Design an enzyme around this catalytic site. Structure first.
Site, PDB file in Angstrom:
ATOM      1  CE  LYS A  60      -3.364  -2.551   2.774  1.00  0.00           C
ATOM      2  NZ  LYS A  60      -4.180  -2.907   1.582  1.00  0.00           N
ATOM      3  CE1 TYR A 166      -1.916  21.792  31.719  1.00  0.00           C
ATOM      4  CE2 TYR A 166      -0.889  20.459  33.443  1.00  0.00           C
ATOM      5  CZ  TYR A 166      -1.213  21.698  32.913  1.00  0.00           C
ATOM      6  OH  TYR A 166      -0.851  22.840  33.592  1.00  0.00           O
ATOM      7  NE  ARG A 168       0.823  11.751  25.591  1.00  0.00           N
ATOM      8  CZ  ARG A 168      -0.502  11.771  25.729  1.00  0.00           C
ATOM      9  NH1 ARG A 168      -1.063  11.529  26.908  1.00  0.00           N
ATOM     10  NH2 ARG A 168      -1.270  12.055  24.682  1.00  0.00           N
ATOM     11  CG  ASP A 175      -9.942  14.572  28.913  1.00  0.00           C
ATOM     12  OD1 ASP A 175     -10.468  13.528  29.364  1.00  0.00           O
ATOM     13  OD2 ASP A 175      -8.707  14.660  28.700  1.00  0.00           O
ATOM     14  CG  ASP A 238     -11.995  11.836  31.968  1.00  0.00           C
ATOM     15  OD1 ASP A 238     -13.222  12.083  31.915  1.00  0.00           O
ATOM     16  OD2 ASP A 238     -11.359  11.336  31.013  1.00  0.00           O
TER      17      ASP A 238
HETATM   18  O1  LIG Z   1      -7.740   3.448  25.711  1.00  0.00           O
HETATM   19  C1  LIG Z   1      -7.241   4.124  26.611  1.00  0.00           C
HETATM   20  C2  LIG Z   1      -7.483   5.515  26.851  1.00  0.00           C
HETATM   21  C3  LIG Z   1      -6.762   6.163  27.768  1.00  0.00           C
HETATM   22  N1  LIG Z   1      -5.772   5.548  28.504  1.00  0.00           N
HETATM   23  C4  LIG Z   1      -4.955   6.308  29.463  1.00  0.00           C
HETATM   24  C5  LIG Z   1      -3.777   6.995  28.765  1.00  0.00           C
HETATM   25  C6  LIG Z   1      -4.366   8.366  28.463  1.00  0.00           C
HETATM   26  O2  LIG Z   1      -3.358   9.356  28.275  1.00  0.00           O
HETATM   27  C7  LIG Z   1      -5.180   8.632  29.717  1.00  0.00           C
HETATM   28  C8  LIG Z   1      -6.278   9.661  29.579  1.00  0.00           C
HETATM   29  O3  LIG Z   1      -7.115   9.344  28.466  1.00  0.00           O
HETATM   30  P1  LIG Z   1      -7.715  10.492  27.532  1.00  0.00           P
HETATM   31  O4  LIG Z   1      -8.828   9.835  26.795  1.00  0.00           O
HETATM   32  O5  LIG Z   1      -8.029  11.642  28.430  1.00  0.00           O
HETATM   33  N2  LIG Z   1      -6.503  10.872  26.498  1.00  0.00           N
HETATM   34  P2  LIG Z   1      -5.283  11.963  26.533  1.00  0.00           P
HETATM   35  O6  LIG Z   1      -5.384  12.811  27.746  1.00  0.00           O
HETATM   36  O7  LIG Z   1      -3.995  11.288  26.240  1.00  0.00           O
HETATM   37  O8  LIG Z   1      -5.493  12.883  25.350  1.00  0.00           O
HETATM   38  P3  LIG Z   1      -6.595  13.898  25.130  1.00  0.00           P
HETATM   39  O9  LIG Z   1      -5.997  15.247  25.105  1.00  0.00           O
HETATM   40  O10 LIG Z   1      -7.344  13.425  23.932  1.00  0.00           O
HETATM   41  O11 LIG Z   1      -7.529  13.862  26.282  1.00  0.00           O
HETATM   42  O12 LIG Z   1      -5.760   7.334  30.026  1.00  0.00           O
HETATM   43  C9  LIG Z   1      -5.497   4.200  28.344  1.00  0.00           C
HETATM   44  O13 LIG Z   1      -4.636   3.610  28.983  1.00  0.00           O
HETATM   45  N3  LIG Z   1      -6.264   3.563  27.402  1.00  0.00           N
HETATM   46 MG   LIG Z   2      -7.091  13.389  28.284  1.00  0.00          MG
HETATM   47 MN   LIG Z   3      -9.782  11.701  29.823  1.00  0.00          MN
END
Ligand SMILES: O=c1ccn([C@H]2C[C@H](O)[C@@H](COP(=O)(O)NP(=O)(O)OP(=O)(O)O)O2)c(=O)[nH]1
Ligand SMILES: [Mg+2]
Ligand SMILES: [Mn+2]
Ligand code: NA
Ligand code: NA
Ligand code: NA
Ligand code: NA
Length: 323
Positions: A60, A166, A168, A175, A238
């Site tokens: 691909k 955040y 990271r 969120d 969350d």
């Molecule tokens: O499938 C998942 C989703 C999240 N997680 C963990 C890692 C993730 O960084 C954390 C918070 O999930 P979010 O859905 O809030 N994602 P994140 O904060 O990384 O990115 P975003 O800015 O989209 O919220 O929970 C998992 O282990 N498995």
């Molecule tokens: Mg998040």
């Molecule tokens: Mn979250």
DNA sequence: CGGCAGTACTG
DNA sequence: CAGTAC
DNA sequence: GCCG
């Protein structure tokens, strides 16, 4: 780093929204790999070589170079855009989206007037646009601060940290993921009732998606909040309350990324270990189906470095876990 | 052949 | 439990 | 989808 991924990303999302999760997982990994390679692939060999790219995927990537367009992208079901539209409603996944489609629904107007919604989905639809917007990290700070202030108000000992994207270091956040614990290893118990009612008093929380408050064992809160003043949008919030003893594993988990946790957990399994948001275990017994049959021992992990160390891996900074 | 992460709510 | 989401 |  590469522009053949923008073509695969389309396929990955198509299989994902259609429910073909494993194939979608395969594309996701192939894409995370590419995006991690500096020297844009050029030869079939330069493809297969990379881990996460096999014959099928290599073939691909080639078409994208010798043709500049992937054929299959023209044979994607017309149902995909609608399935994506529907699954973007919080609380509705692939199964629900496919059912609604089968029922003849094609737009959110259709959902609003004809579909039966769970309590979560109704909230998800109400904030459909809000939940698809990412907030500037500066706003995530104010939110983490609003929760931290409400928590420390009735107990200055409570340690509050914003994780996920955040921690990271991303510029924008989907969120705000707040982790809450306590150094004494006990005062974290039964605080959700207090914290949530506090945040509700000042009108900060606007909707609850997941919150088992009748259970003194509540571990998580998933909801909606909105800062005061004009020009504010509703944001997803969350929260997880964990015992200090599981602080390192909870922090590692909540910081992610998701694909990062999966890889790390997959690794631990290959070492006869098991990694979760609660702890890292060794001597874990399992069957032929990779299913855990034996508990194993919990290993001491006072810090994230300990987890990496026990797994025989060099420690990575949060910003280096953005997979 | 078959796993692909491990876990917490909801109804 | 299946579905969903972190 | 990939890989052991
Ligand atoms: O499938 C998942 C989703 C999240 N997680 C963990 C890692 C993730 O960084 C954390 C918070 O999930 P979010 O859905 O809030 N994602 P994140 O904060 O990384 O990115 P975003 O800015 O989209 O919220 O929970 C998992 O282990 N498995
Ligand atoms: Mg998040
Ligand atoms: Mn979250
Ligand atoms: Na490879
Ligand atoms: Na979604
Ligand atoms: Na959804
Ligand atoms: Na509830």
């Amino acid at each position: 780093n590469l522009h053949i991924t923008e073509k695969l990303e389309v396929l990955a999302k198509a299989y994902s929204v259609q429910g073909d999760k494993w194939r979608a997982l395969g594309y996701a990994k192939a894409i995370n790999a590419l995006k991690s390679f500096h020297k844009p692939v050029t030869s079939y060999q330069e493809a297969c070589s990379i881990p996460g790219i096999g014959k099928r995927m290599a073939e691909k990537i080639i078409e994208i170079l010798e043709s500049g367009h992937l054929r299959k992208l023209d044979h994607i079901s017309e149902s995909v855009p609608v399935l994506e539209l529907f699954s973007n409603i919080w609380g509705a996944g692939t199964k629900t989206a496919q059912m609604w489609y089968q029922q003849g629904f094609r737009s959110l107007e259709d959902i609003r007037s004809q579909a039966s919604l769970t309590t979560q989905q109704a909230i998800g639809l109400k904030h459909y646009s809000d939940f698809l917007e990412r907030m500037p990290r500066e706003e995530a700070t104010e939110i983490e601060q609003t929760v931290q202030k409400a928590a420390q108000a009735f107990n200055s000992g409570l340690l509050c940290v914003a994780c996920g994207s955040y921690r990271r270091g991303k510029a924008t956040c989907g969120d705000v993921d707040v982790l809450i614990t306590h150094p004494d290893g006990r005062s974290h118990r039964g605080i959700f009732s207090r914290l949530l009612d506090s945040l509700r008093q000042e009108g900060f929380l606007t909707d609850d998606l997941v919150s088992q408050e009748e259970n003194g064992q509540q571990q998580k809160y998933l909801g909606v909040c909105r800062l005061p003043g004009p020009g504010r949008r509703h944001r997803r919030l969350d929260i997880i309350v964990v015992p200090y003893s599981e602080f390192a594993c909870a922090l590692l988990y909540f910081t992610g990324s998701a694909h990062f946790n999966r890889s790390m957990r997959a690794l631990a399994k290959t070492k006869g270990m098991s990694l979760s948001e609660h702890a890292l275990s060794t001597a874990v017994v399992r069957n032929t189906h990779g299913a855990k049959v034996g508990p194993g021992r919990v290993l001491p992990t006072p810090t994230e470095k300990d987890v990496f160390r026990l797994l025989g891996l060099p420690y990575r900074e949060p910003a280096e876990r953005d997979w």
